[PDB]
Amino acid sequence: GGPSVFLFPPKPKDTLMISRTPEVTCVVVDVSHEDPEVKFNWYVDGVEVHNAKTKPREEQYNSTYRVVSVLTVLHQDWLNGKEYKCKVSNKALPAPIEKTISKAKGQPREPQVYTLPPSRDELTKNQVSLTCLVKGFYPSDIAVEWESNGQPENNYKTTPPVLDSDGSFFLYSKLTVDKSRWQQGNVFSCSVMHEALHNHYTQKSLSL
């Protein structure tokens, strides 16, 4: 026994557009089996609020339960670097655990987006890789997706943000397409959403 608490930041895509709802999430896992009750206390910059909503206590799986408390947040507050403390109270837990999270406190830097064609070596394979390099951005809260002429593409993966040498972050997004589709005239785009970008959105095309 002995429950652990994990606190999660709001999704970046949700941060960017006021049309979406950004949510900070406190997740309690591995809880007791005779105490199906936990109390959440949220604080914004040291001031308690009651915006929150606790999830039902389900299920285990393996043993125990996971309780999830979701407090949604204001778009501006997160970006302003407001602190969010999630005090989890359990009664099978000396002593109640507090977790704090916020935006990275530093100088915001706009990402440089570079689309990169498949290696001439990779041509021999049936599937080729379209690589989108995004570098020199801060903070790491960023969203990377791929699109085609009219519909978005999938089966692509994006690397975790990596701290660069100059103190900034970069990552890679690798889109996998059939080589037959590449040697045609198809146009692929790498769309990037970040707070430091103007209109919190940029896009780069990659064609043959």
Ligand X SMILES: *[C@@H]1O[C@H](CO)[C@@H](O[C@@H]2O[C@H](CO)[C@@H](O[C@@H]3O[C@H](CO[C@H]4O[C@H](CO)[C@@H](O)[C@H](O)[C@@H]4O[C@@H]4O[C@H](CO)[C@@H](O)[C@H](O)[C@H]4NC(C)=O)[C@@H](O)[C@H](O[C@H]4O[C@H](CO)[C@@H](O)[C@H](O)[C@@H]4O[C@@H]4O[C@H](CO)[C@@H](O)[C@H](O)[C@H]4NC(C)=O)[C@@H]3O)[C@H](O)[C@H]2NC(C)=O)[C@H](O)[C@H]1NC(C)=O
Ligand Y SMILES: *[C@@H]1O[C@H](CO)[C@@H](O[C@@H]2O[C@H](CO)[C@@H](O[C@@H]3O[C@H](CO[C@H]4O[C@H](CO)[C@@H](O)[C@H](O)[C@@H]4O[C@@H]4O[C@H](CO)[C@@H](O[C@@H]5O[C@H](CO[C@]6(C(=O)O)C[C@H](O)[C@@H](NC(C)=O)[C@H]([C@H](O)[C@H](O)CO)O6)[C@H](O)[C@H](O)[C@H]5O)[C@H](O)[C@H]4NC(C)=O)[C@@H](O)[C@H](O[C@H]4O[C@H](CO)[C@@H](O)[C@H](O)[C@@H]4O[C@@H]4O[C@H](CO)[C@@H](O)[C@H](O)[C@H]4NC(C)=O)[C@@H]3O)[C@H](O)[C@H]2NC(C)=O)[C@H](O)[C@H]1NC(C)=O
> Interface with its own copies by CB under 8 A: which residues?
2, 4, 30, 112, 114-119, 121-122, 125, 129, 131, 133, 135, 155, 157-160, 162-165, 170-172, 174, 176, 204
Q: Where in 63-102 is the site for ligand X (CB under 6 A)?
A: 64, 66
Instruction: Choose the contact partner of 14 out of ligand X, ligand Y, its own copies, none; CB within 5 to 8 A by kind.
Output: ligand Y
Give dist(CA 79, CA 101) in Å, integer. Answer: 12
Q: Is residue 64 part of the contact set for ligand Y (CB under 6 A)?
A: yes
**How many residues bind to ligand X according to rule CB under 6 A?**
13
Residue keyed to tokens 């606190």: 7
CB-based contact 161:142 (threshold 8 Å): yes
- Residue 111 Cβ vs ligand Y, minimum distance, rounded to whole Å: 22
Please state the φ and ψ torsions of residue 78, each to the nearest 5 degrees.
-65, -40
Quote the tokens at residue 78: 């997160």
CB atoms within 10 A of CB 3: 20
Which residue's CB is nearer to its own copies, number 54 or number 89? 89
Give dist(CA 171, CA 175) in Å, integer. Answer: 13
Instruction: Choose the contact partner of 19 out of its own copies, ligand X, ligand Y, none; CB within 5 to 8 A by kind.
Output: none
